[PDB]
Structures are given as structure tokens and as C-alpha cells.
Nucleic acid binder design. Sequence first.
RNA 1: GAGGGGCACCACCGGCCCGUCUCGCCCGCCGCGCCGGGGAGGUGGAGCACGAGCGCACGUGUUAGGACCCGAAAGAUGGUGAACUAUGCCUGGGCAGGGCGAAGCCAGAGGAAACUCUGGUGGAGGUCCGUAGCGGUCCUGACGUGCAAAUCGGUCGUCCGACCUGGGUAUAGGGGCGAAAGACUAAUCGAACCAUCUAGUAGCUGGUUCCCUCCGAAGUUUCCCUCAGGAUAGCUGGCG
RNA 2: UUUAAAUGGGUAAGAAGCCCGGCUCGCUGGCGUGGAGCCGGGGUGGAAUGCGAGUGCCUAGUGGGCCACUUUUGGUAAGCAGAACUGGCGCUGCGGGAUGAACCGAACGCCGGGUUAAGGCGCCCGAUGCCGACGCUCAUCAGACCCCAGAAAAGGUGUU
RNA 3: GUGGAGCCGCCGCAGGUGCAGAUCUUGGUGGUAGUAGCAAAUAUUCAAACGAGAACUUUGAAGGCCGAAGUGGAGAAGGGUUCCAUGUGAACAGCAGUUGAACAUGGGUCAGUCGGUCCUGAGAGAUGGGCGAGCGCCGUUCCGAAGGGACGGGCGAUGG
RNA 4: GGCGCCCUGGAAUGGGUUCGCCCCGAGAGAGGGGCCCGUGCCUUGGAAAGCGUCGCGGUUCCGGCGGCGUCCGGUGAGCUCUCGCUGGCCCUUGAAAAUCCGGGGGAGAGGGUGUAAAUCUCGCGCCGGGCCGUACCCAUAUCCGCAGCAGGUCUCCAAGGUGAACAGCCUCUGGCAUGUUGGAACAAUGUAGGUAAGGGAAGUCGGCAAGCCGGAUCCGUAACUUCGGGAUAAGGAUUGGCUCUAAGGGCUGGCAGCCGACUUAGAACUGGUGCGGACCAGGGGAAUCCGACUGUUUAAUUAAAACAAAGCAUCGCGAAGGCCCGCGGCGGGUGUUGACGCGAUGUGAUUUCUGCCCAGUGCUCUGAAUGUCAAAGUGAAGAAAUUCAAUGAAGCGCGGGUAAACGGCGGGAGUAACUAUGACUCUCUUAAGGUAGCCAAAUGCCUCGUCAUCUAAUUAGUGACGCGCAUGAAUGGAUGAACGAGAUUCCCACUGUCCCUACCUACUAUCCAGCGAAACCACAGCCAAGGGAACGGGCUUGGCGGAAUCAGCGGGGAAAGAAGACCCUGUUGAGCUUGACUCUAGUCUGGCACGGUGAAGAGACGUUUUUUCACUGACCCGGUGAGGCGGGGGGGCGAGCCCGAGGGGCUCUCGCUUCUGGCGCCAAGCGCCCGCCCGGCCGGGCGCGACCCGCUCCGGGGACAGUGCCAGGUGGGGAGUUUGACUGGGGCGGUACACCUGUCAAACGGUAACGCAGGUGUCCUAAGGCGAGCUCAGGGAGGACAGAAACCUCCCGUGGAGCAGAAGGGCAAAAGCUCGCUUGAUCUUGAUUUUCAGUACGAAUACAGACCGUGAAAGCGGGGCCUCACGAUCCUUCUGACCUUUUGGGUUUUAAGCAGGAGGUGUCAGAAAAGUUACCACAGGGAUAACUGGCUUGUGGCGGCCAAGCGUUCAUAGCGACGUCGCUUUUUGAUCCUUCGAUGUCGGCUCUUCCUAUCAUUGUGAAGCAGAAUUCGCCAAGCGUUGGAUUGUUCACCCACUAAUAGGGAACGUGAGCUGGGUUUAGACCGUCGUGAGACAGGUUAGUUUUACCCUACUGAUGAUGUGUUGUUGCCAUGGUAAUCCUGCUCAGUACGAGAGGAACCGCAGGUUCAGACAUUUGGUGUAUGUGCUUGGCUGAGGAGCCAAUGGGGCGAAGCUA
Length: 252
Amino acid sequence: GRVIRGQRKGAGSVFRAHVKHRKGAARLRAVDFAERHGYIKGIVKDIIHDPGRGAPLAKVVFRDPYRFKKRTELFIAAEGIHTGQFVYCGKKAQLNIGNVLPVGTMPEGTIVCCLEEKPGDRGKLARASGNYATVISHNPETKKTRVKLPSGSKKVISSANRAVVGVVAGGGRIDKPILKAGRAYHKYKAKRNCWPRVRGVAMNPVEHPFGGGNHQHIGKPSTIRRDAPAGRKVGLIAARRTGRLRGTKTVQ
RNA sequence: GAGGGGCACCACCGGCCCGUCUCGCCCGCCGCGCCGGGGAGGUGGAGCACGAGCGCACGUGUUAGGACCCGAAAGAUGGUGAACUAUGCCUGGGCAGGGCGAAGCCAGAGGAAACUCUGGUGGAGGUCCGUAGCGGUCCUGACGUGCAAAUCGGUCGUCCGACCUGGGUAUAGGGGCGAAAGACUAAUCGAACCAUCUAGUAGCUGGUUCCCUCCGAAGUUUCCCUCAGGAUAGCUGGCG
RNA sequence: UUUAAAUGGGUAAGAAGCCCGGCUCGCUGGCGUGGAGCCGGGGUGGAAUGCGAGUGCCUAGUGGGCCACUUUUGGUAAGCAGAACUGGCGCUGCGGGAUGAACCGAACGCCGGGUUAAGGCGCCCGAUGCCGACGCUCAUCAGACCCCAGAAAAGGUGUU
RNA sequence: GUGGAGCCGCCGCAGGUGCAGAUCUUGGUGGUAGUAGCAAAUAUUCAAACGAGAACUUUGAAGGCCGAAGUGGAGAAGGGUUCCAUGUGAACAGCAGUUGAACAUGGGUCAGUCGGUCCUGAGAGAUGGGCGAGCGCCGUUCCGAAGGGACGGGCGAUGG
RNA sequence: GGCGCCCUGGAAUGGGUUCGCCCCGAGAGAGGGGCCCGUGCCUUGGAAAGCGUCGCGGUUCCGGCGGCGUCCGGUGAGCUCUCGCUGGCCCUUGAAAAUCCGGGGGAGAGGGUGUAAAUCUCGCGCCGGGCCGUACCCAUAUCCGCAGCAGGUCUCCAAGGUGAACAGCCUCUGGCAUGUUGGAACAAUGUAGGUAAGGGAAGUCGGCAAGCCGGAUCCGUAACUUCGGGAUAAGGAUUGGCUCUAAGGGCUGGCAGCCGACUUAGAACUGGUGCGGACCAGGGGAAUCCGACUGUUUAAUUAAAACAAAGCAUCGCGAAGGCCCGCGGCGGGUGUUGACGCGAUGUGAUUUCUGCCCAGUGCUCUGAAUGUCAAAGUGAAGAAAUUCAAUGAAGCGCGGGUAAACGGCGGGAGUAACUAUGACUCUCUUAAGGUAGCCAAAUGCCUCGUCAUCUAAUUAGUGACGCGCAUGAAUGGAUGAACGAGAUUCCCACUGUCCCUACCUACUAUCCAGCGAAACCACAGCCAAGGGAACGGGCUUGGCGGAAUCAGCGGGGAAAGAAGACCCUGUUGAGCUUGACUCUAGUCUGGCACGGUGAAGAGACGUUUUUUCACUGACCCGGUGAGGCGGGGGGGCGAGCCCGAGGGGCUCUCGCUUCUGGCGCCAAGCGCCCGCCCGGCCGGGCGCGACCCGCUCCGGGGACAGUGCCAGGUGGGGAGUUUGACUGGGGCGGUACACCUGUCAAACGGUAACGCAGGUGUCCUAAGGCGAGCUCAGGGAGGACAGAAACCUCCCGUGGAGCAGAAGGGCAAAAGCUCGCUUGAUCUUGAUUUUCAGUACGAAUACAGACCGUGAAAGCGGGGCCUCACGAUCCUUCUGACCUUUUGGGUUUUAAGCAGGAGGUGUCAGAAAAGUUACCACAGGGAUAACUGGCUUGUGGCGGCCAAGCGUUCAUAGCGACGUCGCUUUUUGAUCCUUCGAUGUCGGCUCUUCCUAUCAUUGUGAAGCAGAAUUCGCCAAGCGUUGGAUUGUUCACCCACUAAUAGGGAACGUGAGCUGGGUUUAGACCGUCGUGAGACAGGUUAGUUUUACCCUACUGAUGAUGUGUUGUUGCCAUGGUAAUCCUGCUCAGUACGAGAGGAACCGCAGGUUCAGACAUUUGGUGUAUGUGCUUGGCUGAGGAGCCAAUGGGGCGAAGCUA
Ligand SMILES: [Mg+2]
Ligand SMILES: [Mg+2]
């Protein structure tokens, strides 16, 4: 009769994110006349750190084309960049590390981070620490290019989508063990109120579909349908298969 | 002695009206018909057979209403609470002394070399002993109409850490929050508290207030989701 | 089960009966047959005992019962479970059974005299304080009054 | 006998119509009973003074405790006059009280520079807009003609 | 003090440096500067004030008057605070704004000169600064807890000694009156603190509780190991006081001379072997089970093995997405996000492994493969309502995948040269048959398994074994260091836990002065038996019965607390669960709308359907301060291109920013035009620089998504409700729940029980109807095969056969067999019977009016030879009349009626219905279980009577079959009387009494009694009937001692006497069971045990009545009563006896248990606080003392005491 734990994460009372000491959205600068037709020069000032993100950031000062003003962007730091480096951003930008330029002009098989899934959306895909995407298959008629996401799933996107050349810094992070319960606590204190996950088998029949019984057992099959209602989707939600995995994934 | 007329009422026979049923023939014409009416028998009706009702008052019985009085566990509607406590977040404050001695470093010694050994230095750790703090194992100690609607005395757990804590702030009742004990949410929690619906319902417990006179029971029948209850016949009293 | 009680159950013991003559009928049919109904007429003393009866309306409470002879079912048995007939208790005091729900007598307005019932009469405690009758019995565990509240098989050259 | 201003009989009428009980309701009073009790944190003593009156007030003297993570010195929240003086001893302080945070009368809190005031934090909340039968809610940059100001530069009027 | 500041100059034989590091050709060292903090000192303030001290005036303001002083040094791992310098740790990076300031730019502005402007963050001077808070407490008395409440409640400041220390103990500054009272006494019982001879767990469920060990220095340390640990392992040695010695630093001079720190080591002397002297402070070892650890957890009964955790897996998702919120919006959260991410689960570090199953239940994927399946739409028939038909969404069904999804892992056959088992082979159920491992496990019923080992003795522990009721692999299996306020077993050490208690101390209790309640209370308060609601205080019969009281005490008041939490009932609830009943949010699909423009393709019959592409304008999503969009031309250094002459433009290109941590705006210039200069000077204006036109701001989707509405899926996520009755309590079982036969049943009828013996929910077109002819079961005697049984014949044959089935009744030219016809098993109205209320249904009887059958006819027949074989209202369906009504009147369809058949209610006079609760709640019930008590005694026990036997012989010394009669209430039942507004439920411990059915002790009788020893009876309950191991045990079983180790009762004596082990709440684990919540006298673990001050009883203490008062000395009525058992020597190795063996009485020495006392002796105790020893502190030191809640410790009188 009582609501379950994942149902209470949608109201967002204590399950809202911890966003105070974060710096801002890490977004490419918006497209205008300079990047549709040419390039523009910017210099990165400092490599900073977000709490709760695994990647670092790069704050880059550009020269405003229309007002006399220097205005600061925040980029996802591509790996290998340093402070006091010139960063070039445009259609006619030259393909180096850290330069951001449209995916339709760059060749096939170049490694891409922080790319747009619809044009002008200022960077959505392939942004976690150490991740990247690969471009193949330019279709210069009905201009669409297909990329390869970090999940191995390919996606045909628009050609004028914009993207910084390189891989996201801070990679190899998940190779280290958390190694004790204390350093997992500090990990999620930067992120959310989510960390000590009680098993639903351990709680009571008000609190979960799996709890109860004189023995800790699930009882009911732990693969459930996708059109199950809220408060019943717990466990392996619309699982195509179970058991320890064989092969690679063998389902497109 | 006998005879006669017989009230009311009771029993019986006969008749009458309405519905139906069988059997049968006749009659009438604001128009001759897939019309109207009648007969003789048997049956169904809360009927007729020279009317008794109405209004008013009182008494008894039963029913619907708070319904002889008091009593739930509930359900619903609309509100008030995070001054305790649960968890986030904001901004502050707090934690003696010792023990072990990681990485780094320095010298010396062995050795043909590869390298090894030794002594320092160094001070790491959800590291150990252990104050303040935070807890609350054992005595199954004291207290148990207590100092106290949970306290005390030893003893004990942990004290750089998932640490302890103040004020600010957020989340609210089939909701919240929960390192999960159905824990905690103002001494209230396997669904809070306030007011209303509400005098909710009870075949179930308790109670039910003056005197004398007369009569005086039953615990059995049949039916019931009936078995601690009713209805029905018996038993009773009252009126005639 | 041939036979077959006791106890028991129905019915009859009159005028609403008995008899005679006549009329109706569409029933019955050799028949003025049969049977029903109907009218008129003739004569009342028809077992014992006891009692005044008939009928209608309204109607409360009750719908857990229990007990004892007798007869019975289940049970080793039960102050057990379940029936039959009658009485009682519940609703009921009183005399007695010391005691008591139900045993035995007897049912009850308020009192005086008398007499009894069941039970009794050494003393509690009313009444044997009779010159009561005949026998039986000795217990180092005597006996002592329906229900009823304690005993059996077996044995004694104990006594009759 | 107390009491000090109303009351009753009869014939009809009408009821919030008579108590011993409901772990009844409210109020009062017992017995228990001058009883249980006034036992956590080492401790009091002598003299004096004022007074009707002193184990407890004050003052001196001795002896002790706390022992600087204090029984010491100041604050925050909270309280609200509890602070201070004099008077009082009815009640209250669970013995007493000549004492008090009690009662009675009268005093006391002074700021440019101590804080509030100001700023924003998590967050809270209008307007535009949206939703909604509606009280209203969502929402905080989102679907908004969201600047009322100006170093300036010039015209036009207008004034010392 | 700091500097990641400068200049000179260049370093290697590398140097400078720190406690550590670190720094250097990107400039070290060295030399000379610069800057920042200066909270320190000097000075102004400022000595005039402050304080200390010595005076002197002033009665009263006096912030009186005056003298002198307020001075030199040292030191430090010191404490506290501040400033700084450098490191480390982070999958953790540790706030915003208000304000304030520097810098860059240079639009402007300024006096224009032999004088002063604009300006000034410089030095002084003037004016103003409103509003509100401001006392005090801040806590064992100002706050919260009902209060002056051992509780709670945020901070800062903090001295001397001892010492590692903000420890403990002692003192100074500053506080206080011992915590809401004083006095006297020093009994019990308590609470808190000690101590104890000898023994050392013998106590106990358990070593619970207490005690040991404890600091530091010097040695010395194992198994095991994840190599880090363990580890303060373990095990030793030492420690004082006093003298000394040796070592450990600073600064001044040209290697020496003057001052400072408390450490370390070594030796001597010394004391009654005493030294961490108080204080502070690790008991250790060997093992097993569980959890890796640290963490966390039910505030107020559980701290754990639970939860969490790192690690390991699996799952969903590329944003119009996934998972959630929301009454609502394209509203919110994850998301200031983007697969190294978010969301959803499970297992639980490491190491080592992860077996076999896709049948089931889920989950998931697919081909115009196909079964089923809604609205809308399509077609047909009809006058229409309406009806039918075909087509076919998702889902289901079918097929595939998936077990680190829920989960499951059994049998049965054959098979090896003793037997056994089965490597092997073959199959069933149901897909597979439990692999590696592991085990009587926290998982094994039987079971206290068997076997080793530990003990004198072990239901314990450990190690094995393993067809294992019911082990098993992320339900995770097995190991394994470290760590557990976890569970358990042993060993050492230690001890009053125990033998077995004793004594001392504080605080009480006790008495007094003051002050003073509450629970509770029908009336009350001495018993034995009887009866009684079966356990009286009162009642009956007995015993008996003096005031008034005090300190105790726990037998009784079935003592108080509470309308039993168990159990049952209720047509009372609630929490959860699901393959319950009924729905619901949500979501997946189809339709119609919003919803437009075009093209192409396809399926079926111009008609209809469907698909894919293109468009954009609705609609939607991004982005932006809606900042350059689309077409068109300006420019060749680029193409000079189809050809080629000076060039032409089928086809064309874009542009001006890319070695570097710099700057970039507010227009230059050119052309025109005005007022201003007489063909020249000021101040303004416009354009080109900066192309033109145009209808979305730019991109991305787009007639889809989305939304409104309806139809169908799915939907315990959520809501509502339900969960039969009877019942020797309930459940399970059964159906005695509707019905029929025989009996019970007691000779009319009626009659109960979960009484007995059975039966029914059908069967039958003949097994209904009628007529005719016939005789059955069985037997005898004959007949080819032919027999017990074949068919044929004759005789006998009263029902011994048959009649559909259960019984009972009935029946012979029959009610049975065979045959011939038939449909009366049809239509219709009443009455009667049965059950019964004298209602209904069902069944039946007698008719009547029809139409029929059969028979020659009489007749018989409206179901079955009779007794059973079945079913309301409402609804539905069919039939019946040339019927009645269909609402203003007609016609027609339909609908409603009337009449009677059917489609059901078996809980059968008829609801529509799954669990669980140990998290539980209410109303009740002793109408009703679990406990005692009561009736009963089957059963358990203990006895007799008879005598076939046994006993060499010999029934009865001792036994005794086949029987048979009893007792007892210590067994277990049976029953259900008392108790449900409560009688506290096992065992042990402690303690008193009682019984006898006698184990021992006294006196005896009988043996198959030689003696010794046994055995069986008698009077007899006087007196005894132990110490232990395992176990919660009662019970058991074993070791040992003994005269003997007999059995019982007292509300299964005894919880205001205890304990809490067991059982029996709530947490948790395992096994089996269930889909699940949950269940299991199956196992394991952790789990609040309240009150006497009342009345009596008992125990002690005053006293009361009576004697005139009072005293001394006495008597005894009555009541209590207490002693017991063994051993040794003697008798004696004698009697007796073949021997072996082997008595007793008298006497004598002790002892055991028990009872009464006592302190000479010896132990304990000890606060004579007696005496000296001693640690830290304190009084200036000595001397003498004091404090440390009794500072410790050695001896100790008296007194108590074994
Ligand atoms: Mg978890
Ligand atoms: Mg009689």
C-alpha cells in the first residue's frame, strides 16, 4: 500500500541533484556567421574540475564579433589540451586536437567527442570521461552523416552537426576500485541522494514487490514487462535475455 | 303439557355478479360482420344476498425515525503539524595524550656482477590504546505508587571518520522519509493529529427507579448462510 | 419367526336416533330397478361416575433447560453423551434426610386450639424417665436407617 | 425545636413521572494512617548580632568540597521583570525561616563606530503566460513591446 | 619574519640547502638593493590617569592632598592564540552576491602666458549621522520536561604539583553549604564497598558476578597468513631512597674564555625483598559455527549471524529516449545530464570454482505463417427499427531465444567369475535427473546415529563416516588471514560461584521533633471435615473463642494492577498476499476529428481498400542579446574554358582571421550640402566606405507526432468486498446439509445421537399400456460325443426364482417368461392424502369431462408392483388463441401481457465470493479448548483367589500359565462441572509437613536358612535415603561413596520466594511446504519477570483479665520435644563347614549425620582508625600532622565467629 523507493525519485524533494559547487553547463558556443562560413580563434584559460563529473572542463575566452567584449565559454575538455592553447572553431577550422568543426567537412574515421544530435543543440552526445564517437559514411546528397556512439550503436545524424575533435579527458577512471565504502560515499555526495541501495528482497511487502517471506527470496519472476505500471517495474525491466552473457551482444 | 312467530349468530342447501372452461342453440340491428346479446353445466375472486361507516379521544401491539440508556475495531470529508524524529541540501562550530611505522629520502656494509643486508630519516591509515564527545554490551545491578510516562551506578562500544553538532531550508498522511527495525513522522504509527458526517452500527455485555390485588409461563414443532438471532405453531394474559 | 401377553390406540353406547307413506332426478338401469334428495306423519326412560358449557378478537414472555423411578442407545466407565413415559426442579417456601436444587412428606392469606404425615424419642434436641417382648452379635479396623456419599471374589474347629 | 415567605386539600388536565446498583455522571467524606515517606553526588562546628522566637538568616573563627573539560567568568536560543532597594511574614518554598526567584510599594536597560538595518546561500515567491467548475494552482526565464535612466551632443520653450 | 621581486655575474671536482624536503643554464652559490606583514619594541598618547605602599586632611561633593615605588635578567619539543612556510589526502576540489579598487583606452576639458586656469585618491577647517535591540538567568532554582524534577539543552576563557597527558588524585584565584529536614540509636532484611583459613567451578542453563593481569625499561616471541599482519602473542627479568661518575649545548675573541636545558647510561651505598608502593591500568591459550572488515540498526524489552558495503554479474535507454512525479498543461525530477552516463535488480572483500534442465510460470523477438478477437467502416435483405454476411488492430494462440529470470535436479529395469554394488545399456513421469564440493551443520525425523578423541563418569565439543526425513553451487558452493560488547567447547591462571559461612564500613530500615500521601476496600477476617457451582471466611457438625498493640514476614485472602493479548463465537474490523469476486489510474492498440498540397505503386469487387516517396502552412522541438537567410550582380591573383585574332563564358570557382597565454568598439578617408570667408575661413548635415531585391528569425521535424473522444487488450500499481454450516473446543476428516429401505423404537402413530446395515442425483419406446399362451429356483432319473456346468425328455417342485438397480413388503392359468397389437409417458378443472405451520414443492390417491389404446367382452390404462429418484420470485426461451394492450385516431413491424413447458440454485424453502496475520484490533463467551480440582479407571500401577506346571524328587521355600475378583489416583486418557471484567503456565534451587504400597536401621517368623550372604512375609514411617559428569530437562544413563542411596503427596506444594535454561510475542538464519503473503511441540540465536504500609497465619516484643496494692520465692494444667547410624579392636579365624571361607551377644575405642551451647587454644574479621611502614599533594622547612567518598599495605587488642 506504501509507495516504493524509485517512485519517490520522480517528485524530486531530496532526490534532486547536488548542483551548488558545479560551474555551469559544458556546452559548445552557439553557431552564428563565424562558424557557418569561416573560423574563430579562442584561447583556453584554465582547466577546471566539476564536482560529480568525471571529466574536467576548459574555459575558453573568445572575441565577440559584434560587441567589443571578451566572453567566456565552457567546453568539455578534450584530452591533450593545455592552457594558453589557441582553439579554432568554425567550418573552415583546421582538424587538430581540441578544434571544433562540423562533422560533414571532417573525413571518415576521425575520432569525435561532444557532438550534436540535432544542429545547433550545442553538444549532447559522447561527453563522459574517456568517451568518443567515430564518424563514417558521408552522404553529400541529402546531407546526412552516420556516427558510431560510445555504446556501439550507430546513428545517422545531420551533416551540419558540430563536434570537437579528440577524446574526452580524464579517461581510465573506472579502472580503479572504489575500494572502500567511504570513498563511494564521497562519490555520490557530489552527485545525488542515491547511494546506499537497499535490496527490495530485504524490505517489507508494503515497500517492494519482492520483499516479505520467512526466507529472503524473490518468489515471482524477476523479468517484468515494459507496460507494467509504476511500483511494479522492479528488477530486469523488459529484459530480452538473462543469465551470464555469452557472445558479445548479438542483437541489433 | 303443548303449539306458534322466530333476533343475532353458527352449520348446510339453493340462487346472484366478475374471470375462465366444456357444451349447445336462439335473438337484435345507427346497418348484416373474421357483428352485438342470451343459454346450460363446472370452476377461480379479498364479492351480492335490505347498508355501517366516518370523525374525535384513549389504551395496547408492531414498524420507520438517535428510538429504553451507555459501549466499539471502523469508514468518509476538510484541515493542522518536520520545536522530537527520518533523510537531503545551506552556512557555521568541534575532536588530549600515546602505539604500530606505508610510500619517499640518506648514509654505511657485503658482492666479480646482478643485487642483497643494516641503521636512520620520513609520518601514511573508513589503523590500534584511550580522554571530551557520540553511543548504549553486561549485571538479566539499583529504581519499578521512581529523581525520571526510560533514570542511575559500575562495566563496556567507537573516537580523522560512512565522525559529532547548532541555526537556516526542503519533503505531509494511503502521504513523507527510511545503511530496512513496518523503524520514524511532536510521550500517538502494520497508516498521525484536530473538527465534522455522528447520538454511525452491534443477533453482543452492563443497567433499567412506588405499593398492594388477581392470573400465570417456556426452553418444544416447522422454515431460515439457520446454530448466542428471528419468523411460525404450542404454552399465557387481557377483553368480551 | 409359526404362536404371542400385560400396558396401549380407534369406534359405538340415540330424537342429528327409529319407523311409515309420498314426490323429485338429466345419476343408475330387465323392472314402479338401485341410490340420493325432499315433504308430511308416528311414538323419548336408553352404561357408571363427575362437571356448567360454547365461541371470537387482541396478545406479552419463551425458542441454552436440568433431575429422579421405569424402559432404552453409544460407552470399560462417568456428577458422560442421546432418546421414551410421568412427576419435579427452574418459578417453591415448609417438616424430615446433621449438611443440601431435584430425595421423603406436604405445597403457603394473618392467627388460636386440636390432630397427624415423613421422621423420630440416652444427651446436644421436643418426645420411651415403657419395671416393652423374642433372638443374634465382641471387633487389637465393631456396627449404626431410601437417594447417600466406600467395597469384591475367596476363606474361618469364631459363634448361632 | 430550628427557619424567615410562601403553601395545600378536592374535581378534572398535562408530564423532562418515584433509584441501590449501570468498572454510572458530578460533588463531598472516610478507613488504610499520623502510615509509606522527607536516604544519589564526603560535613559540619563554636561564638556573636538583630529578633516574641534561631540546627537552617547574617557576621567573624575553624574544618571541608568543587579544583581551571569547575559547583568559576561571560554569551546565543528560551524566558519576561524573575534584576535592584526597602517593607511584610497570611498563603507558597514539600521541616523551620528573622530568608527568598513569594507578597507589597518604589526604582532600573542611554550607541555614527555592539548587533539588527544591507547582501546573497540552499530555497521561498508575485507579474507575463499556462492550467483550472472554483477558492486558486503550476511556474521563476520559461509563449513577454518586461530599459522611466544617462557622462554626453544639439534644437525648441522656460527662469534667476 | 616572509618574498615564484631586481641588478651584477656564471656554476661540474656539481653546489646551496630542510626536521622532511627541495632549488638551479627558464640562472645555483656569492655581492648589492626593492617590496609586503610588523598583532613586537621605542615614541606621541602618557602619567595628568591605573595599581602597590606609607601618610595627611576633608562630617556632606570628595572621579581629596602628598611621599616613595611601578625595577633587571634568563629560558623552553612548555600550554593557549595568531601569523607564516612547506608538504600530504580526494572517482571528495571544499559558496554566491552587495560593495570596493587598480589598469587599458582617449571621446573631452583647460589658461593660453611673461599671468593664472580647469582639476587634486595631498595637508587642514565646517556640518550631519535618524530607527530598533540593550536589565538579568543562561541552569543539580529564572529555559523544556505539570514542580526549585539525579533527565535534556549551542559556545568562549582556563593556574600550580604528579604524570606521556584538557587522565586520576591534591591545592591557589573564584564559588558553595552536601543538594526539598534535624536528633538519638547501631537489631533483622536490604542497597553500596571491602576481607577471609583449607580446597579452587565441586556452584550454575552457562566462570553470571567478583578476582587475577595491567605503566614503563631490558630481553624473548609460535601456528597460521591475503606477507600487511598476528604481536602488548605467549613466557621471563627489573623498578625505591641516596650519593656520584660519564655523555649530550650556547655565545666572545685569534684554538681558548663566560653562561643555560632535563634528559640518558653506568656504578657504589642502603632498607624487615620493599618499591607503577595511592592514583592510573590489556587475564591468557587451543578450537569450531557465522559475518570479510570500518560503518549502521528496532528512541522506551532484541546491536546480532540482520542491514549496508567494496567487489562480481545481469537488465533498460542515443533524448519525440529510459525510469519516475502530476487533478491539470508537451507541467515537473534524474538533468548545470549523455553509455567510463542515468535508471532497475540480485549476489556480497580476496582466493577457488558457477554443474544439468527453456517442459511449467514469466520475459523477449519474427515472416501480408495462420486459429481466435471490438468499435468505426463495407455489403445484402427489409417500409423502417433492426437483422445477417464478408473483411480483420493489438493481445492471446503457434514458432524461436533466455536459468548470475522464478525455479526444478525422481523413479523402474537389466548388467562385473563369492556376495554386494553397478563403470555399462535401455526406458518412463514432467524438461533434466544433484556434478564439483559439504555434512548428524544454525540444514538428520528416526537419534542420546555409528566411530575415534577429550573425562573417573559427557544427550556437550572436536575429527571421521555419509542412497542426506528435507545438503548443494551468485536461493550462490567450498575455503580462508585480520577483526567481532556475536554463538559454543576445553585448558592454564585466578578467585566466597560453591564446600559454608563469618565479620567490618557507609546509606537506610528502627525510635523521636516537624511535615505527610496512594493503590486498595460487599461485609469482613482462627481452623478440621461434610455438603455445595465438585478447593468456604460466613453455612452444618466438631475444635474452640479476651482488650490495645510493635518490629518483621511472605502461607492464605483462588491478594492488587488490566472488560484474556491464547482459544472459540460474531453474518465485527484492519495490515499484507494472490492463478479470489468486482472494478480502476496508467499504458499498448484501432477509429473519428484537428489535418492540408502532389506523385507513384499494390490488393479485392468504374466501386473500395492500402503502401511508399515529395511538399509546407497547422502542429511540434532546438538555438539566439531572433546579428548577415535565399536569389541577384560587383572582383581575376585565381578557369582564360567548347575554339583560338586583338578574346569569346555549353561548364566553372570564393576571399581575404592558423609558428607564439599581445592589441582590436564608439571611423578614417573620399564625395556632396548648409550657415560662415568676397572667387578664401569656422561649425554642423547626408551619402559611399558597410552592394541590391525578398513573404517564415535561423535550422530540425511535419500531416505524423501530439491532443480531444470512444472501442478493445492489459492492469493486485491501486480501490471495494468476500472467505458456508453441522461438529463430544476448533482444524483436518466426514456429511448425520435434500432424500429412500430394515433396525433402534419400548406390539396404533410419533421419537434423538458424527447410532447400526446399506442406498439415491439414474435407467426404460419398453423395463409404459392391454390381451393371450405359459411357469420359476433347485433336485431326482434317463439320453452319441457330453465331463460339476451344453441340449433333449419325464417326474417332484408354496415361490427356496424373477420382478432395471438398496432393502422391506407384495405377486403363480401372476405383478414373472414368451408373443400379438399399441402410445393413457396425451388434453382439462377441482378435491383428498403424505411432510406439515396442517404453508409450498415433490410424490400419490379417488374422481369428473374429453379424445384414444387393447381385449370376444367384462374391463383395464392418464408412466414404471408399492415405498425415493428431485427445484420459488425475477430473468430468458418455445408453444397456445383467427386473444388483450402498445397512451389523439388508423395500418404494419416490434415490444408488453394472459396460459404452461423448459434453461438453475445439491448450502437441495433457492448470495454472486480466495487466502494470510507471531504486527494485529474490537464485541463477547467458562454456552467453548490449553492448568489444577471433580466424576470415571479403559490404560499405567499395586494386589489377591484357583492351580496345569517350574523348582533332582516335590503344585503352593521361592514362583506360577489358562482364568478370574479387586484396589489406587504418583500414568495417560475420557468427559466438560468451576474459572475468559485473568487463579501468573515447565524445570531446578530453597524449605516444612504428610502418606506407606519398608530400600536401610529396631524386634521378629519362613527358606531349596551349615556358616557368610541372600530371599519371602510380619509389627513399624521413629530415623536416614548423598557427592558428581552429559542434558532446559521431569525422566534417563554413567562414575564414585554408602547402613541404604525406597516410592510418592500437599492447586502436577512452593515466581508480591528466586532463577529464566526451556516454552510462548515482536529481529534474524536454515531446512521442508506454499504461486505468494506466510506456515511448521522441526533446528538455531538475541529478547523489561511490577506492588505488602492492609487482614489473618507464623515469628519474636510490650501488655490485658483476675488476685486490695506491690514484691520475692514457687507449683504445673496444657502445648512442644531428639537423637541417629557406622567402624575398629576383643569374642576368633573360633562356633559352623569336606574344604574354601566365616559369624554373633557382653565389653572397649572412636567416628557419621543431627541438636544445644562456647571462645581457653588455633583460624577468620578489624575504622580500638591501636601502632609503626609508605605513594601523591598541602601546612616556609624540621618536628608534628592532614586530605585521597576507609589512599594503599604489615601486624594487631577487645568483641563477634567456624
Ligand atoms: Mg545492497
Ligand atoms: Mg413415592
